[PDB]
Amino acid sequence: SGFRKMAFPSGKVEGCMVQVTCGTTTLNGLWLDDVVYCPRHVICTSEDMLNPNYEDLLIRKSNHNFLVQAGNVQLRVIGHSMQNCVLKLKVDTANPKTPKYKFVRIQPGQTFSVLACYNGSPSGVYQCAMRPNFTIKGSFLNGSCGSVGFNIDYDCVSFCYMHHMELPTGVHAGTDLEGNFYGPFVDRQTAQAAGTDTTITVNVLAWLYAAVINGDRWFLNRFTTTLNDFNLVAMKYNYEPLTQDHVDILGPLSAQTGIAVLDMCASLKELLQNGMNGRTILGSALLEDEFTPFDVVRQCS
Amino acid sequence: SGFRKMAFPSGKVEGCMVQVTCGTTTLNGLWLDDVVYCPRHVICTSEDMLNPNYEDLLIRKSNHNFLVQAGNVQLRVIGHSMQNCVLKLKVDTANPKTPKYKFVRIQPGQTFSVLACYNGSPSGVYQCAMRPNFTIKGSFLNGSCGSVGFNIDYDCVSFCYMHHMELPTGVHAGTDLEGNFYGPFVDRQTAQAAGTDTTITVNVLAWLYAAVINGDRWFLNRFTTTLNDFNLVAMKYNYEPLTQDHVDILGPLSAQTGIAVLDMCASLKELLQNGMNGRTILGSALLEDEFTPFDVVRQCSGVTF
Numbered sequence: 001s002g003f004r005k006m007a008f009p010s011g012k013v014e015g016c017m018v019q020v021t022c023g024t025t026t027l028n029g030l031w032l033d034d035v036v037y038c039p040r041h042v043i044c045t046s047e048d049m050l051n052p053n054y055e056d057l058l059i060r061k062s063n064h065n066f067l068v069q070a071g072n073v074q075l076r077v078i079g080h081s082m083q084n085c086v087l088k089l090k091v092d093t094a095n096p097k098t099p100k101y102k103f104v105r106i107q108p109g110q111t112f113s114v115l116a117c118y119n120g121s122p123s124g125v126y127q128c129a130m131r132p133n134f135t136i137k138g139s140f141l142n143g144s145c146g147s148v149g150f151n152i153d154y155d156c157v158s159f160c161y162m163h164h165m166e167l168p169t170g171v172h173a174g175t176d177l178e179g180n181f182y183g184p185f186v187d188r189q190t191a192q193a194a195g196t197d198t199t200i201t202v203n204v205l206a207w208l209y210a211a212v213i214n215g216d217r218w219f220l221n222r223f224t225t226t227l228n229d230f231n232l233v234a235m236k237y238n239y240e241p242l243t244q245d246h247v248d249i250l251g252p253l254s255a256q257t258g259i260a261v262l263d264m265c266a267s268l269k270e271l272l273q274n275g276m277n278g279r280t281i282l283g284s285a286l287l288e289d290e291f292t293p294f295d296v297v298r299q300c301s
Numbered sequence: 302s303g304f305r306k307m308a309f310p311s312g313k314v315e316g317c318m319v320q321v322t323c324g325t326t327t328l329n330g331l332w333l334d335d336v337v338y339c340p341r342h343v344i345c346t347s348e349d350m351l352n353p354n355y356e357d358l359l360i361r362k363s364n365h366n367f368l369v370q371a372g373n374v375q376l377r378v379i380g381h382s383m384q385n386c387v388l389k390l391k392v393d394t395a396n397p398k399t400p401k402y403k404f405v406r407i408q409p410g411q412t413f414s415v416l417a418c419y420n421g422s423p424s425g426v427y428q429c430a431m432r433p434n435f436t437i438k439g440s441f442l443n444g445s446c447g448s449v450g451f452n453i454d455y456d457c458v459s460f461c462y463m464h465h466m467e468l469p470t471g472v473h474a475g476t477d478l479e480g481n482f483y484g485p486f487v488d489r490q491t492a493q494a495a496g497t498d499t500t501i502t503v504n505v506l507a508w509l510y511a512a513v514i515n516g517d518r519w520f521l522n523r524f525t526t527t528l529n530d531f532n533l534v535a536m537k538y539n540y541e542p543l544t545q546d547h548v549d550i551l552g553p554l555s556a557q558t559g560i561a562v563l564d565m566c567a568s569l570k571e572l573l574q575n576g577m578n579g580r581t582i583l584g585s586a587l588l589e590d591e592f593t594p595f596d597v598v599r600q601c602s603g604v605t606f
């Protein structure tokens with residue numbers, strides 16, 4: 001029993017964190033096999049922040065300009081290339097702590113664990129969701145660039161995010177491990193704004209099922225709704241549309257608790273209309289949207 | 302920017318998790334040097350748990366009765382002893398991944414990270430607080446017994462908790478690594494209830510400072526209070542008393558934000574008597590009490606391990 005925001009154990013990723021220094025900029029790198037991945041903006045100066053030509057700046061760089069440190073050992077960079085917004089630094093040593101891994105690009109609503117690092121040293125691990133506006137609501141200070149988001153599948157680490165920057169609202173933008181940004185963001189100091197954020201409806205419903213599995217039933221009601229009537233109500237509270245894919249995904253939780261998805265959808269409509277009236281669900285006074293249907297099943301059963 | 306519930310990186314502890322099997326019971330063990338620590342109830346059966354004489358049950362067990370597995374390698378138990386509610390299994394091999402560590406008993410209100418394990422394999426890490434009623438509001442399923450709570454101080458792991466059981470309300474009870482239970486709990490199948498819980502006042506204040514550091518200032522007011530007037534109000538709302546030690550500990554955050562502790566207490570006093578009025582603090586509609594003053598300083602200043 002109980003329901004917590006749970007991150008994956010971070011050991012497999014800690015053994016990959018290194019410090020990457022280029023001139024005056026120091027950030028984090030991910031050392032997998034003989035390659036160190038890090039944000040390409042590590043090659044930027046003060047004059048290069050507004051409109052950097054990364055291909056031009058990288059061609060001017062030599063391998064000896066990149067200082068890579070794994071613990072108290074300096075690694076030798078024997079090559080450098082760029083893949084989208086990620087810099088790949090070939091090193092002369094394969095990381096002996098390289099876990100079984102994959103690079104996976106995630107969709108909005110998906111959750112992952114963040115290992116926040118500074119100077120190639122892990123300082124904390126927390127759980128995040130890719131917001132519908134493609135930002136992440138992280139906890140990052142200057143120096144955290146290169147910190148990664150990941151999930152663990154049995155023994156395999158799926159790297160899904162690399163931290164690049166903080167937007168003016170304090171939210172975070174980054175890329176997958178192939179250097180492709182999540183969202184309409186660019187690695188330039190040009191004016192960029194996160195789009196209006198919305199609540200991840202499928203995740204709220206998954207969390208309502210987690211609450212029922214844990215014995216919290218006060219919010220349940222005798223009503224059901226059509227999918228279309230639910231979406232018309234949901235949109236008015238800035239909630240993401242719930243698709244037939246989401247209804248299907250909630251099927252196992254629906255079967256386990258005996259509450260149809262459209263039936264839970266009517267509970268959610270009522271909660272949006274009434275609020276919680278001084279009550280809590282799983283110790284929370286707000287509707288939690290950073291637990292996916294997969295997270296709920298994994299944590300509860 | 303941002304403020305998250307953050308656990309310590311769990312790698313140093315993951316390299317210590319093993320699976321301990323005794324008869325039909327399988328749970329987790331903590332392998333440090335040549336000793337595997339685990340809850341002593343691993344030696345119990347259904348009848349035994351009802352009223353167990355652990356000294357009697359342990360004397361009947363042999364070293365070969367404890368099956369210890371570290372990954373896919375079986376460790377051989379060369380000795381067994383009991384220290385309070387923890388079983389210590391001497392093994393022939395010292396854990397090569399043993400970090401610098403200490404066993405520390407924590408006080409209520411102190412936070413720690415939990416590495417939840419099943420079958421000696423870590424499955425999740427979360428941050429939580431030792432409630433004033435000595436329970437933890439954890440997230441644990443059957444098979445999680447032996448999962449540990451820890452903090453990291455520089456390069457040293459301080460083990461502070463080992464999971465033993467779940468109380469009827471779904472909250473959790475366990476011991477320090479010396480086998481002493483936190484709270485008035487016993488490791489036996491009997492009627493046990495967690496006492497009425499209270500809010501960890503010093504931690505709420507630390508979290509209000511974290512909200513100010515993040516730009517959330519709507520709850521600040523012009524007023525100040527006394528430690529006595531505030532404690533009278535706090536007691537009324539089932540909040541733990543705030544001591545001069547707590548005021549002193551909140552000093553650095555008071556200095557950084559320019560908000561005196563008794564100034565923040567008057568904000569907390571108004572929040573208690575009036576509510577949030579539809580507003581949130583750090584995206585929460587409730588006052589968060591599972592961040593200590595040290596946690597807030599560590600997170601809002603990026604200390605690494």
Ligand SMILES: O=C(Nc1cncc2ccccc12)[C@@H](O)c1ccc(Cl)c(Cl)c1
Pocket residue numbers: 041049140141142143144145164165166167172186187188189190302
């Ligand atoms: O935002 C950044 N770092 C931070 C990350 N994460 C959190 C931070 C908090 C405060 C200060 C900085 C933070 C920059 O290093 C940065 C600025 C501009 C651009 Cl366009 C790029 Cl690609 C990167």
Ligand SMILES: O=C(Nc1cncc2ccccc12)[C@@H](O)c1ccc(Cl)c(Cl)c1
Pocket residue numbers: 001342350441442443444445446465466467473487488489490491
């Ligand atoms: O509570 C237990 N385990 C669990 C722990 N933590 C969470 C659990 C969730 C579901 C089921 C079981 C859980 C028991 O194994 C147990 C029963 C009685 C006693 Cl007196 C003792 Cl010492 C231990």
Ligand SMILES: [Cl-]
Pocket residue numbers: 550553594595598
């Ligand atoms: Cl402090």
